[PDB]
Amino acid sequence: YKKIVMSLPLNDRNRLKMITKEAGKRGFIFCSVFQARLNNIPKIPIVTNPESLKRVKSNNLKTPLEWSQDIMNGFNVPLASESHSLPDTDSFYLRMVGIAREHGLVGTVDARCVELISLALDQYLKNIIEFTIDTVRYRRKKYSDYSGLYKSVSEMAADKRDAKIKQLDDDKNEDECADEAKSINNGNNSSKDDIGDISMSSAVNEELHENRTISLTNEDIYDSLSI
Amino acid sequence: PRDVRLLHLLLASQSIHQYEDQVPLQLMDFAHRYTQGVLKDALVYNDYALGVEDIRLAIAARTQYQFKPTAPKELMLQLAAERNKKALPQVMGTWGVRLPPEKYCLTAKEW
Amino acid sequence: RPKRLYNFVEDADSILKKYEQYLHSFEFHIYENNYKICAPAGLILTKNNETLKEFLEYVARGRIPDAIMEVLRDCNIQFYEGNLILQVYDHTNTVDVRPRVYRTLLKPNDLTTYYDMMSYADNARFSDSIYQQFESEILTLTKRNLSLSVPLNPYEHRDMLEETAFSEPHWDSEKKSFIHE
Amino acid sequence: SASDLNRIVLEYLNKKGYHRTEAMLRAESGRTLTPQNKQSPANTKTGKFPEQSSIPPNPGKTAKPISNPTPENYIRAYSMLKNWVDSSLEIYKPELSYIMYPIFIYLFLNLVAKNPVYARRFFDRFSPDFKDFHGSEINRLFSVNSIDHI
Amino acid sequence: RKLRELVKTVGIDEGDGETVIDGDVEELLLDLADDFVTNVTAFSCRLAKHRKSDNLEARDIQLHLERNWNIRIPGYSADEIRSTRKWNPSQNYNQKLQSITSDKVAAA
Amino acid sequence: VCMYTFQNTNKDMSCLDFSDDCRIAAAGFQDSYIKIWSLDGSSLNNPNIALNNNDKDEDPTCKTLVGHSGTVYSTSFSPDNKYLLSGSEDKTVRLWSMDTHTALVSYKGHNHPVWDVSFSPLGHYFATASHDQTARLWSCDHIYPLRIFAGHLNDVDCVSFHPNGCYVFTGSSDKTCRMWDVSTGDSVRLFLGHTAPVISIAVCPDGRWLSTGSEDGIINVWDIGTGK
Amino acid sequence: TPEEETTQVLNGVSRSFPLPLESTVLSSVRYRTKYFRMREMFASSFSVKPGYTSPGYGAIHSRVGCLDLDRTTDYKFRVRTPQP
């Protein structure tokens, strides 16, 4: 067309290459709904290959009926958001064996990498907490060779989440620390996960003034408020 | 250079006909650093265990913290649903703009 | 030009009132200190656990949890215009002659449509634009009841209005003051 | 590939719980255009202001766009006429200066019978303009605050 | 109650003030740790599968934390992890650098 | 059409806006200023008859506002016309008083640059567009957002309300736009048919028809009932 | 002639689209575990009503992946679906 001055000084090998490319070089996927589906689903390792079948039968590793139970028992661990404490060795072990059965590893998880994970979490959270601590205060006795007590708030762990933003996993956790950690003053934070409803301002409904005792849906939410 | 005019054809293939001069230079100096880091980490991962799955490990090691994440719509939908539980607060009814309380505004501050 | 006059319901109470005298979709039971989630006709009975303490936060907010969509498609239960009817039985406050029956409605989210599409992606293998067109067509056919009608704008008709229906800044002695909180 | 999308839509409605007549009527409702609202920018004869009721908006209590067709207190309803006659030093000024008094008096006497605090707003808002024109009658109308005060 | 001990060993008085933590920050940092664990072991499982094995040894985790996060835990298997290449270029590359230096001196 | 042409801006003036009564113009610069022009040649000093001092300064009938640290990509005027709302690439939206020329409130709820701020019809609460593929609903008295509008595939470019202030319209760079319920947060309409990033959207004062323009030079109109 | 060569070069550049070899989907631990837990409760609760088979494996009873022991670097795999 009009690019004779530019498409010509490409060499003959380059042009003979670039008159051949097409769509259909891959075996990939690109539908992002399907990528999120395959990242969501739990997958169990199966066997069809005969050499790997005799390799997994020799080392006394079991059939997929045990790896599916191991998936379920690695998922059923009380993960550390619910327990409000750093996890222990059995929780680490069960979660890591469930993850290793998710990825395909049908072997055994070593007992020293759990302690390595423990020290990794130690130094990770110590780095984050230290570079939040030395920003609310200038420790004059430290950082030198010759006031009171402060509590770090969630706004501070958002404020030094960005002044030193390299310190994070950049996964979901930093997204929720940026997106949902800051609360407006009518947020009703000290709660029981349900009392921010509109009907808890408008009067507990009483009971059983009826022969058939079918009730209304504004009473069912008061029933579920108690639990 | 061959890749300056190849970047000319790449930019023109996505309908970018006006740009400056140092923009393919910046694209080439990005691609050099990215490929050098990827191949160095892949040489590490091949001394550990070159091949294509080695390159896949070396570019999955650094996908996790720099470029645009993949299919983030369902996590954002979950996060939106956690934020859109709370009903909207009571608004003023005096047809104007209401400020926050005075300590939450950039006025009672000092230098 | 429309051909008929249509009567479509997009509330909770009106859909429930329309769908009384109909067979329910779920069957939930509140026994003493343990619960049971069965089908209308091996159905499990749970201790006070934390999956149920998070499912109960999705029935005081009348919406379906996003996790259940595919398995509802597996379990052949009856949907009702995208919603499903939870019939709760409180056996602690029963009457003698039957427990206390509640009948609430749970409403679909954007998450329920996304998880329904993600579970459609198992055996269909569609692209992204087919999901876009499918979502657009369903958001057309199932989201009626739009409040698209404009009132008067009070900022142009300022001369025919009370003077203190607006809140502008004023200048006090040597400073000025806005409205806060 | 649009007929296959139509079939996927029909099977989705069938599995998501729409009756055959109900799905046919929702399709026919989806196809026809939004008709004309004759009060489209809310013309100032049959149109109202939005309520200032300190609640956030809610798109419920609302019927469909497919179907065919589509209290106001005294102080603003007097301030409209007040500004309309106040924007004129024309040939018709002093006749409006004449007729502005008894409409205010009758609005005040019809508003003390319903809402007393709105009436106390309405009296002292438009008090000091014609005191020199109508004497101590507005001073006599200080002590009216209820139905029995009339 | 372990995170209060972690902030206790980070923030001590030491003659200059004690820093404490609040509950919302505890839920935030516990979610951060909860996602950090899975993000380390999911790449470590890929490394252990890349090593054509079935067990999840500690060299995978120590390699994955040395290369990417550079936490640098002292030796658990950190003598096999420490790979020493000198990163000197090839013979074509030094030839091309000789050509570039020759043109840079022949230009003047 | 009355055309306001700005002269000595060396390609470093982003999108501008005029107030209502057309007395103030606001232009966001690439070097983190907001420039405020009195379009009538007025004083724009708000002297408040006391008139203390400082005629020694240079007032070229134009005030500069320096509160941002990134480049200002959008700017919106209140219908009250007394406040200005400037959205930047530093991850804040700031509020300015147009009668003392200072900053009042910083609004931090984004982690990517802000591209389109827009007040409500009644001036109640403003919606925001950003690079993180989500729109956010705010309020002028709350520091942090109130709703998150998520569901687009690419980032949100333009934002606009329905003229009653009851729906939100967001257009995005994945060749589509959406109508969002302002209370429940979830999308009510998805409009497909474009072939380029939707860059400006506007809904008619009737309210039944939506119009938007893309970067392909094609405007198109849908009706919100049928959606086609 | 340079004209057919130039148009076929521009035909070649107009047909090449890259995909990434490794893309890490932005997700969570907690939403994944809570999705699994709620799906396990409501999957164990009801029945299947099959034509010939039900989905799931031992103690899953839902749509479960079929990743092989080898080919762990594959991008897609089969799932379980109730077959009539």
Coordinates of C-alpha atoms in Angstrom, one line a residue, chain G residues 20-73:
Chain G
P20 CA 0.8 -15.3 27.4
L21 CA 2.3 -18.7 28.3
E22 CA 1.7 -18.2 32.0
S23 CA -1.1 -16.1 33.5
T24 CA -1.8 -16.1 37.3
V25 CA -5.6 -15.6 37.9
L26 CA -6.2 -13.1 40.6
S27 CA -8.2 -15.0 43.3
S28 CA -8.3 -15.7 47.0
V29 CA -7.7 -18.4 49.5
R30 CA -10.8 -17.4 51.7
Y31 CA -13.4 -17.1 48.9
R32 CA -12.2 -20.4 47.4
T33 CA -12.4 -22.2 50.7
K34 CA -15.8 -20.7 51.5
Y35 CA -17.1 -21.5 48.0
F36 CA -15.9 -25.1 48.5
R37 CA -17.4 -25.4 52.0
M38 CA -20.9 -24.0 51.1
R39 CA -20.9 -26.1 47.9
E40 CA -20.0 -29.2 50.0
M41 CA -22.8 -28.6 52.5
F42 CA -25.4 -28.0 49.8
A43 CA -24.1 -30.8 47.7
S44 CA -24.2 -33.3 50.5
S45 CA -27.7 -32.0 51.4
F46 CA -29.8 -32.7 48.3
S47 CA -29.9 -35.6 45.8
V48 CA -28.9 -35.7 42.1
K49 CA -31.8 -37.4 40.2
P50 CA -29.5 -38.9 37.5
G51 CA -30.3 -40.3 34.1
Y52 CA -27.4 -42.8 34.4
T53 CA -24.7 -41.2 36.6
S54 CA -24.0 -38.5 39.2
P55 CA -21.0 -36.1 39.3
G56 CA -18.3 -36.1 41.9
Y57 CA -15.8 -38.5 43.5
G58 CA -15.3 -39.8 47.0
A59 CA -16.4 -37.1 49.5
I60 CA -16.8 -34.3 46.9
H61 CA -20.2 -34.9 45.3
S62 CA -19.9 -31.8 43.0
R63 CA -18.2 -30.8 39.8
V64 CA -14.6 -31.9 40.4
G65 CA -11.5 -31.5 38.2
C66 CA -9.7 -34.3 36.3
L67 CA -6.1 -33.1 36.2
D68 CA -3.8 -35.9 35.4
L69 CA -0.8 -37.0 37.4
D70 CA 1.4 -35.9 34.5
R71 CA 0.7 -32.9 32.2
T72 CA 0.4 -30.5 35.2
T73 CA 1.4 -27.6 32.9

